[PDB]
Symmetry: D2
Subunit: 376 residues, 4 copies
C-alpha cells in the first residue's frame, strides 16, 4: 500500500497506511492556513481488495456543505475520471476503493496540470486570429498568459473571460479549453459571428501558483485573488494586478469569471445587481443573457444560487462587481458544481470536464445572444 | 485527360475531352426525364495546367437560380471539399480547374455514399438507447432503415426527423449524421434532457435509390417522394409508404424534414401555416421554435425563404403539411443552401458538411426549447 | 427476419427465411458461372435469439478445404469484424448468430468497398512523393489506378506491388493500405531508405469490377486475371493489359503479387522457380528475401504453401512467373489466409485487416533487405 | 522579450535580455555542480523579428563534441518539435529564432514531462497483460514505477528494459513509449510471439527527480545512476537500488539500457564484452542481436560507437556490465543521437521522438530474433 501526492496539483498528507480498512489521510491547508478542500493523490495497492481511505480532517475544510452527497473523483488512466462511493461521518470523508488496477488517482475534481495549461496556451497560437501575451509573472515566477482572439479592431467589442482564480476549481480551466476549442472553429457560425463583432481576452488560469501547489482558494502567499480586484498589488496579487491594468487598456463590454462551487449541486450565474452603477440597461442585458443561457444549456438553471446583493451593497473587491462597476458592463460569475447537476444527475461521473466543456460552448451562444446589445 | 462517373452517386456524361480549354460535359437527367441538377464526377489530367470544364446542359436544369453565384464543390482527398471558380454563361456552367493533383472529384455538393450511409446506421447500433428497424425495401431493393433513439416509453413524445427525400440534397444526410453524433453523446445535456422526454424516429436517407443513381429529385422510377405523402404506394413510393405507416403507429409530436435549396443562399424554415388544421397553438409553437433556432444558430435567418401559404391552401401531399395536418403537430421543412449562407459567407468552402453538422446540433436545441410544449 | 446483399461487394441468394433454426441461402457464382466462395450479406432479425444460417451450395464452392475449420466474419458496426461459430457438414456451411444488435453483416472476409478504394487512392495524393496515374477503364467502366511513390527518378529501382486480382481476396487490399500508410511516413527509416533507392508502382485494386460484383475470382466477364499475363486484351482483361504495358515502360526489379488463400491457415510466399529464366542469382535473392521476411514478421512461415514448380514447368500466364520470366527479377506471390495463422491463432478474429496491415509493414522490411541486391 | 524556465524539466539562466541580437543565457549545472548540457526554456518576444540567443557557458558543458553540428530543438505548439539554425564558436552556442509566434519553447531535445510519464504508466494499466508495480520513492519523493507486461508466468523468460538513467536523454523515454504501444497491440505478431515466451519488466523513467529538475545526468543529489549498479543505496541512488533488487527476484535473460549520446550523430549499441563472465555464447547472441537489429531498422549502424572494453576490463558499476556479468545474459546499452542520424539526415527535425518511437518498434523485432536463443 502506497499514497502519493508529489506532482503538479497534488495534495494529501499520509497519517497511516497500517490498516487497509482504515487508511488515514489529511488535506494540507493552503499557504497562510486559512482554507482548504481540494485533494489530489495517487494510491497503489493489491487489486481485488476493497480499501477504505479516510480523509481525517475533512471536517476542518472551508465548505462543509460540499461534503454532503459528494463523491470523490478517481481515475485509473488519467483520462476517464469517475466517481467513487464516498461518505462523510464524524468529520471524515470516507472513500471506498475496490481497486481494479494497482494504481488509482483520487481527487476533489479532475485535475488540470500546468503541463496541460502550457499545451493549451501554446497550441492556440497556431490559429491565425490568436495571439498570446505575457502579462507578467506570478509570485512563484510562473507565467500569467493572456489569449487574445480576434483581429484587434478597435471598433469591436471587448469580452473578458477569466477562469481559475481559485486554483482548486479546475472545472473552470476545463470550460475555458472547451470554449476555446469551439471559438477557434471557423465552421461554427456562433464563433464566426462573435469574432466578427468582438475581440476576446481570455485567461485560462488566473492562478498557476495555487494550481501547482494544490491549493483550493489562494495563490502562493495565501491571497484570495477574488478580493484583490479593487486594490491589487504586485507584492500580494500580481495575478489580478496585470489583468486589471490590461482591462483599462482594452475596455470591457462583457465579463465572465468562471468558478466552481463546493456545496451546491447546480450550475448558476451570480450577477452584479448590488453595484452602485447598476442600471435598467444592465438589468436588461442580464435578463437577456440568462434567457439565452437557459436555452443554450439544459445544465443551466435559475432557482438555486447565491443570494442577491441589496442595491449598492455589492462587495467591490470581487472581480464580477469590480469589473461591472468600473466598466459599466454585463458581468457574471459562473459557478459549476463539484458534485453534479442535481437536475440531470450522472452517477457514473457527476460534474465532469466533458460537461464543463459543453458549458463553454453554451456560454458562447449566450454571449452571441447579447453581442449587439452590449457596449456603446 | 479523363472524366468518370461510374460510382455511387456519380452523374456526368462526357461530350468532349479534345480541348483542355473546353472539356464538354452534360448532366444526365433523373429517371423519368423531368428533373436534374446534381452532378458528381472525377477528373484526371496533368497537374499545373488550368482546365475549363463546361457542363453544356446546365441551362436545362430544374433550378436556374441555383447556378447564379454558384461555385462547384471539389476535393482532392475526398475529405476536404472546397469551392472552384465557376461561372454560368450561355446555358453552360463553366468550372476552372487549376489541377494541383492528378485526380479531383467535382460535384454539386459534398457526396454522401450508400457505403457511408451503411456505416452510419450500423455504427449507431452500438449505443444502448439505439435500435435500428428495417422499414422495407426501396424499389431497387435497397434498405429503408429507421433509427430509433430512446427507450420506447409510451408516455414520451415522438420526434420524427426525415432527410434526403431528394437524393441530391446530401447536406440533409450530413446534418442527420451531425445530429445523431450529438444526440448519442450523453455528456451533452440537451441530448439527455431530450431523451428523458422524447423518443426519436430518424430516417437519415429517405431515398437510397435516387442517391446511388445520382438523381437530384426522384427515386428509381422518377417519383418525387415529397408529393407522395397523402397517397403513397408500394409500386411508386415505397420509401414514403413505410414511413407514413410507422408514423401512424408512433404518433408525431414534432416533425423535421431536412432538405436543400438550390437557388437561395440562406438557411430557412418553411412551416405549414396553410394546413386546414392550423391553429393558434401551432402558430405559437412555430414562433417558439423559430425563436429558439435563431438563438441556437448564427447560420439561421428568417428574412428570406419560400412564400407562405394562404390559410387552408397548403399542398397536403408534401411531408411537412401532410404530417402537420394529420398529426396536428409542430412541423417544418428545413432548407440549407447549395451555395453558401450569404450572411456568413465562406469563400473557401461555401455551405459544407461541417456547417450542416453544426446545424444538426443547433436543431436539437430548438427542439429542446419546445419539448415541454409539444404534444398533449 | 431479413437478408440483403444489394450493396457494393454483396453476395448471397436467399432460399428460405421461414425457419430461424434453418435460414437457407446460396452463394451466387461469378459471372461465367465457373467459381464462387466469397459471400457478403446483411441480416436483420430480433436480438436475444440464436439463428442458424445455412449456405446450402457451399459444397459446390471452388475450394472445399476452405470450409474446414473456417469461421465466418461478421460485424454489427462495420468497423470491428469478428468470427462467428461456423461448421461445415454434408455440403452446407452453418453459421450461428446470436444477435446482440438487430442488424449484422456476415462475409467470407472483411469487405473493402470501391468507395474505400476511392478514399485510399485519393488521400495518398496529398503526399509530395505520391502521384496517381489513370491506367484506363475496367470493363464496367471503373478506374484502374496506379499509385506512384517516389521522385520518379528514372535511375532508381522499380518495385511493383499488385493486389486483389481475385476480388474476394480483400485482405490483399487491406495489406496495401497498411503498406502505403507506412511507406508514406517519412519518420520510418525503412520507408526513407527504400524511396532513396526505388520508385514504387502500386495497384491497390487489380479488379474493381469483380470487387463491386461480389465475385471470388474473376473480373466482369468471368476472366481469371491471374491467367491473363501472357496474352491479355482490352476486351477481356484490360486490368492486366494496362499493367503489363506500364511494366514495360518502367522495368521491374521486385514484384509482389498480393493474394489470399482459402485453404491453408498460414502465410506463405509462392515464388517463380519454375520459370525458364530461373537462375542461381534469382534463387539467392529469393532466399535473402524469405529470410528477411521471416525476421520481419512472426506471422510468416515457410513449411506450408503450394508445391514448387519443376524446372521450366511454370505457367507463364500467372503474374509472378510472367513477370519473373520477362524481367528476370525477384518475384513472389504472397498468400494470406481467410482462416487464421494456425501458428498464432486468434479466436476472436482469426486473420484480419489489422494483421494484413501489419504484414504490409513487414513486407517493406523484407524488401529493404534486398534493395541493393536487386536491380541492375 | 521574456525568458522562463519555471516548469517541469526547465533549464536556463538569463544573463541579459538587453539586446535582441545578443540574448545572453547560461545552462544551470546539475545538483552537485559536476555536469550540464540539457537546456529547456520558453522565450516570448515580438513576431517578425530574428533574435539571437547565446548560451555563454556552452564551452563548459559536459560533452563539447555534442555542440559541433548540433541544432537546437523548438516548438510553438509543444506537439511538433523542429530544429533551429544553431552554431557553436568561441565557447558560445548561438541559436537563431525568427519568431512566427509570440511564444516558442527551445530545448536540447524534445522534453518528456512527469505529467506525461504519469499518463503513460497510468494508461498502460488498462491492458489485460499489463500490471504496474510501485518499486519505491525517489529522493524527492516521486515514484519509481515498473511496468510488467505478460501473464506473469514464472516459467517464462525475463526481459528488462530501462530508460532515462540520465534525465536529459528524453529520447529514451520516447522510445519506451513507442515500444509499449506496439508491445500492447495484440494484432502485432512480434508482440504476440514475445509475450508467449517472455515477461517484460520496463522502467520508462529511471530518474524522475533529475527529469523534473532539468538535469542532464544525475538524480536529485548529483548521483550518476549508471555508476551505481554495483553498490547502490536507498539514500543516494534508490532508483537503482530498487531495480537491482527486483532483477534478483525476476532473473534477467535480455537487458536493454536506453540512452542518448550527445556527440555521435548515429544510433549504436554498446555491449558488455569487457565483463569477466564474457563467453562465446554471449558473443554469439550479441552478433545475432546486432544482425537482427540491422535488419529491423534502417537507422541502426555498427561502424561508429564507443570503443570496446578490453577483456575483463569492464566497469561493473555500469548497468549493462553489471547486469550482463551478474545474470550471464545478453545485455546492451542503446545510444540514440541528440543530433540526427548522419546516414539518414532530416534537416527539419533531426533525431526526434517519432524516430525514437520507430526505433522502439525495431527493438522488439531484434529481441524476437533471439527469443528462443536466450534464457535457459
Ligand atoms: Ca471560485
Ligand atoms: Ca428537397
Ligand atoms: Ca489469389
Ligand atoms: Ca546516457
Amino acid at each position: 500500500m502506497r499514497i502519493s501526492a508529489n506532482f503538479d496539483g497534488g495534495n494529501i498528507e499520509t497519517i497511516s497506511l497500517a490498516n487497509p480498512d482504515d487508511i488515514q489521510l489529511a488535506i494540507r491547508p493552503d499557504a497562510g492556513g486559512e482554507f482548504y478542500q481540494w485533494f489530489n493523490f495517487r494510491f497503489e495497492a493489491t487489486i481485488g481488495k476493497t480499501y477504505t481511505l479516510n480523509i481525517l480532517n475533512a471536517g476542518g475544510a472551508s465548505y462543509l456543505k460540499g461534503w454532503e452527497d459528494y463523491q470523490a473523483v478517481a481515475s485509473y488512466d488519467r483520462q476517464t475520471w469517475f466517481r467513487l462511493p464516498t461518505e462523510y461521518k464524524d468529520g471524515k470523508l470516507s472513500i471506498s476503493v475496490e481497486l481494479d488496477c494497482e494504481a488509482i488517482q483520487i481527487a476533489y475534481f479532475t485535475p488540470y496540470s500546468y503541463e496541460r495549461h502550457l499545451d493549451l496556451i501554446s497550441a492556440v497560437q497556431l490559429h491565425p486570429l490568436v495571439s498570446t501575451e505575457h502579462l507578467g509573472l506570478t509570485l512563484d515566477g510562473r507565467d500569467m498568459t493572456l489569449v487574445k482572439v480576434g483581429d484587434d479592431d478597435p471598433s469591436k467589442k471587448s469580452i473578458w473571460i477569466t477562469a481559475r482564480q481559485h486554483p482548486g476549481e479546475t472545472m473552470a480551466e476545463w470550460l475555458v479549453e472547451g470554449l476555446l476549442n469551439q471559438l477557434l472553429d471557423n465552421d461554427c457560425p456562433t464563433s464566426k459571428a462573435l469574432l466578427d463583432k468582438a475581440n476576446f481576452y481570455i485567461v485560462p488560469n488566473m492562478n498557476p501558483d495555487g494550481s501547482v501547489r494544490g491549493h483550493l482558494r489562494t495563490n502562493a502567499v495565501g491571497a484570495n485573488l477574488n478580493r484583490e480586484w479593487q486594490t491589487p498589488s504586485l507584492e500580494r496579487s500580481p495575478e489580478v494586478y496585470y489583468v486589471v491594468n490590461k482591462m483599462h487598456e482594452t475596455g470591457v463590454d462583457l465579463f465572465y469569471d468562471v468558478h466552481g462551487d463546493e456545496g451546491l449541486p447546480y450550475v448558476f450565474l451570480a450577477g452584479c445587481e448590488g453595484i452602485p452603477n447598476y442600471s435598467d440597461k444592465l438589468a436588461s442585458l442580464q435578463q437577456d443573457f440568462v434567457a439565452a443561457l437557459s436555452l443554450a444549456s439544459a445544465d443551466f438553471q435559475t432557482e438555486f444560487g447565491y443570494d442577491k446583493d441589496e442595491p449598492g451593497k455589492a462587495n467591490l473587491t470581487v472581480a464580477c462587481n469590480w469589473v461591472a462597476n468600473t466598466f459599466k458592463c454585463l458581468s457574471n460569475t459562473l459557478e459549476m458544481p463539484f458534485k453534479d447537476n442535481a437536475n440531470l444527475a450522472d452517477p457514473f461521473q457527476g460534474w465532469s470536464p466533458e460537461r464543463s466543456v459543453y458549458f463553454g460552448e453554451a456560454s458562447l451562444i449566450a454571449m452571441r445572444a447579447v453581442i449587439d446589445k452590449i457596449g456603446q
